[PDB]
């Protein structure tokens, strides 16, 4: 079981944003929810506890609500320091291989125009195949805001095993970059007609495809 959150939300300074946390039932539906903030190179910080109560020192901009199996965090008057990751949590969600924390969500304070990712997908080199290894490489560059969702497919089928993906990183031109690798046996590689890398960013998904020679 999981507390699913949106991968990302974005807004200009001063605007309002909302973040959802959906579960059940046995967790949210009958239990308190807490929200935590985490800025890049620091430790998490409690923003909300008992659904809507703030600890001391937390701006009144941050508010929490809860309805049915969904909880919600709300930030009014977005400031630049609000750009961070946000996680929802409930102490009930530990009880069956389930995760206490949400997924969670990246909040972006817009400070430049949005940019769609340039996606490049490389098949395994012949040199790597002669070494009895196959690695598919998906490179995603020059996108903003810095949040993407990468998914792999083998022909029409979805893939999750053998996949590793990096967190987005700030390039020199203030835009973001990321990469995803799909590690593979030449048998697996040759067994399908094609493999595809699907990158999702801002209501758009670009899929690139490669096939055995």
């Amino acid at each position: 079981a999981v507390l699913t959150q949106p991968p990302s939300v974005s807004a200009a300074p001063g605007q309002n944003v909302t973040i959802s946390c959906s579960g059940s039932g046995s967790n949210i539906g009958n239990n308190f929810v807490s929200w935590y903030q985490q800025r890049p190179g620091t430790a998490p910080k409690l923003l909300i506890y008992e659904s809507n109560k703030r600890p001391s020192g937390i701006p009144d901009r941050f508010s929490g609500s809860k309805s049915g199996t969904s909880a919600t965090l709300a930030i009014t008057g977005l400031q630049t320091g609000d750009e961070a990751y946000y996680y929802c949590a409930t102490w009930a969600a530990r009880l069956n291989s389930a995760r206490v924390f949400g997924t969670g969500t990246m909040v972006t304070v817009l400070g430049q125009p949005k940019a769609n990712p340039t996606v490049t997908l490389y098949p395994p080199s012949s040199e790597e195949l002669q070494a009895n290894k196959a690695t598919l490489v998906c490179l995603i560059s020059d996108f903003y805001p810095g949040a993407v969702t990468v998914a792999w497919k083998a022909d029409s089928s979805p893939v999750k095993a053998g996949v590793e993906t990096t967190t987005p990183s700030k390039q020199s031109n203030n835009k973001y970059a990321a990469s995803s690798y799909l590690s593979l046996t030449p048998e697996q590689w040759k067994s399908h007609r094609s493999y595809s890398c699907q990158v999702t960013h801002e209501g758009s998904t670009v899929e690139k495809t490669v096939a055995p020679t």
Binding site: A43, P55, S97, E127, L139, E164, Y181
Partner: protein, 234 residues
Amino acid sequence: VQLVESGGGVVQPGRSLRLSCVGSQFSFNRYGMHWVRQAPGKGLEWVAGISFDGTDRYHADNVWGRFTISRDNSKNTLYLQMSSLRAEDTALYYCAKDLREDECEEWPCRKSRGVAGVFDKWGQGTMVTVSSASTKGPSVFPLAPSSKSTSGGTAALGCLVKDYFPEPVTVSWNSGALTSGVHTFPAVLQSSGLYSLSSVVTVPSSSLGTQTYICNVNHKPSNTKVDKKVEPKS
């Protein structure tokens, strides 16, 4: 309120490790405590929890039967005894304080409030790495341009730097004579403990029959350098 973690280093699978978190500037004996972990660069994951006196212990199912949380209030110290480590246990381990202030009401403690499951204070954390990998240099493979690039526009050519340890690795192109059509990406932590990254450069397609392109990888921790020529091939 201060939480300081320690004990986190590199370690091999199957073996063991004991993490420690010392707390100060608060009544450590009145609050429950939690161990929470964060693998890079992912989300938070609650590992273990303990009440103020240690009568009530909680462990995630990921670690049930191989991790054990404990505390010594006489020394204001929290302990996480990890055994049978796995590569999946590789993460940054945070010590976190439970929100609820607790005292015993009836006489272990018969009647109590218990932990709340809310983490109001954290402590930067200590890194635990599980890898059976000793120091070794990378294998470099060419990421060749698309065949459908001949004449006209542009082409992305790169090199894949695979299976090395530890960090860091650096990549240049043509000995520094080529510095921007260029992206060098962060590395990934493969399941084998070994690291991998890629570097790509975008150039004109007409230049792919005259100009030679070479990626220069440097991996100092293993005293290795690798120069790889990236050809269009057929």
